[PDB]
Design a protein around this ligand. Structure first.
Ligand code: UMP
Ligand code: UMP
Lengths: 316, 316
């Protein structure tokens, strides 16, 4: 099926990957350099061998597409993928007066009752970003996130470039353009960035009326990360195809360091016992066309019949 | 042999590639997304199925490594790969008083005697950059070329980042770093660039004492371009390995648009009749270590026994 390339990557890393130490101190099995393609006319690459929350992937994509960098939009759609970053900044500032929470990500995963004090602490934070319009502007805005990188690349002359926006006008006026690249890797910010872009750069390609996209991802958490990533970009490939009035081609995922954290081997092994189900289909609101003014409801996924989800510890 | 991946890419494009129009108006056969690896411990990937001028590749690499952006260093080592760019700027300025040479690249390939007036014109230019220290600073400096992109990434705060230099200190202090990327794609300069980077970005990787490098190349001229490119980066992988005191791993070449210009089909077809010869070996000056202060003589290639070169028209 469509998602067999994923299952293959995982197998590969299981028996070929070599042990490798890392930033988080959870070890990993790793390979360097890997690529896979998904013919997007065959169906949507949302994994069936495990239940992946599509809702989180699209609320985050639309957050990106809007050029939004404030955690608030996410919280409103009950999406907490980035809270950990906003909270972080907050706990290390003056306004914060409370149970310190230093190196919390670890401690939550390591202590029972701390985890409980931490989430109540976070509970207030999310609610406070959700309600205090000033607090939100102050602690809700991450600044350098894909949205701003994609749509507001700050220049040296103090202005801003709508990188993606320009690229799309280019696909229209020059579909055969070999230079259709959008980049999220800013060399001058990367050294002081808590998390320099994982999805470093991507390129569009047009031929025979079909649009294709290749993504260069420097680091991949094969079990926890890759499944979400695949969906974000295939979705993105469908949106851009929609706007440009082109048919959908393939999504080529290129990898730098594709790894498996040692604390995930039993799970990936289990998922590999499962047979792929037929793939879901993507359905976009035909009446609307400007993808930049797209919202939750203009994107429907039909026929997603996945195996149950698989819990897994996080790496830190 | 080592270079079989190249021969495969070419075959692939021959029967799988689809016709595609382009910038230069010479048509092409193209594929999107392709990757190949070269185990650098097996030998140096300088093609044997065709004689490729290694001298040009290293004088250009050392020009890059020095952070030099002046055509002058090249001319001195009788390397003319970039003259066409300097000349271009010159002919379209005040100081130039002479036989206009508009759209020359084409005309040379299209008219007999114009080609002769053009090269004498260029002859003077190269000599004038080679001798008039002021002319050279004025017309010899291209500005935005890999050297400056690699070593003097201009920031918004007016300063400069030694991108590659930092990355190398990083390989030393944190070889397991997943974030070891050097980038040449500046979003704010790309729109007014005569030729936005073809070699967009590359990443290093360390494990088991071996250093590997993956290159993301957005556009590839399979016949004329790819053979030079492969050598530049494998060489670069050997130099960095030298400095960091690491063994050499693999060179993974990832491609965006890998194409064959229609005006090259008879040649690639001919090269495909040839059987690969054993690969040459690379030999670096052990006494010297700082690759930034490396020059022509500290890099020797032994046992290069290639088939004769293959003339081919250029695309415009
Ligand atoms: O969309 C994403 C974001 C992150 N990661 C993972 C990759 C690594 O497991 C970790 C980042 O590690 P570094 O490369 O920064 O060291 O997060 C993904 O796989 N996909
Ligand atoms: O190192 C290089 C430099 C250039 N090219 C080729 C690729 C294309 O044939 C042309 C650039 O075309 P655009 O992508 O800019 O359209 O030059 C290479 O293959 N390798």
């Amino acid at each position: 099926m469509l998602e067999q390339p994923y299952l293959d990557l995982a197998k590969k890393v299981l028996d070929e990957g070599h042990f490798k130490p890392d930033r988080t101190h959870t070890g990993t099995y790793s390979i360097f350099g890997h690529q896979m393609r998904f013919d997007l006319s065959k169906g949507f690459p949302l994994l069936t061998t495990k239940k992946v929350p599509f809702g989180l992937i699209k609320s985050e994509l639309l957050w990106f597409l809007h050029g939004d960098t404030n955690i608030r939009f996410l919280l409103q759609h009950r999406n907490h993928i980035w809270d950990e970053w906003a909270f972080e900044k907050w706990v290390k500032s003056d306004e914060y007066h409370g149970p310190d929470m230093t190196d919390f990500g670890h401690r939550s995963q390591k202590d029972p009752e701390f985890a409980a004090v931490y989430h109540e602490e976070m509970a207030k934070f999310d609610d406070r970003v959700l309600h205090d319009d000033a607090f939100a502007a102050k602690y809700g805005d991450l600044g350098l996130v894909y949205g701003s990188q994609w749509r507001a690349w700050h220049t040296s002359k103090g202005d801003t470039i709508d990188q993606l926006g320009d690229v799309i006008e280019q696909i229209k006026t020059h579909p055969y353009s070999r230079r259709l690249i959008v980049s999220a890797w800013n060399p001058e910010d990367v050294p002081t960035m808590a998390l320099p872009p994982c999805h470093t750069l991507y390129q569009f390609y047009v031929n025979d009326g079909k649009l294709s996209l290749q993504l260069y991802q420097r680091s991949a958490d094969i079990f926890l990360g890759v499944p979400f990533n695949i969906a974000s970009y295939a979705l993105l490939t469908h949106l851009v195809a929609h706007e440009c009035g082109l048919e959908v081609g393939e999504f080529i995922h290129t990898f730098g360091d594709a790894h498996l954290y040692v604390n995930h081997l039993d799970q990936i092994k289990e998922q590999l016992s499962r047979t792929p189900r037929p793939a879901p289909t993507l359905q976009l609101n035909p009446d609307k066309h400007d993808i930049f003014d797209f919202d939750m409801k203009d994107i429907k996924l039909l026929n997603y019949d996945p195996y149950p989800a698989i819990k897994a510890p996080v790496a830190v």
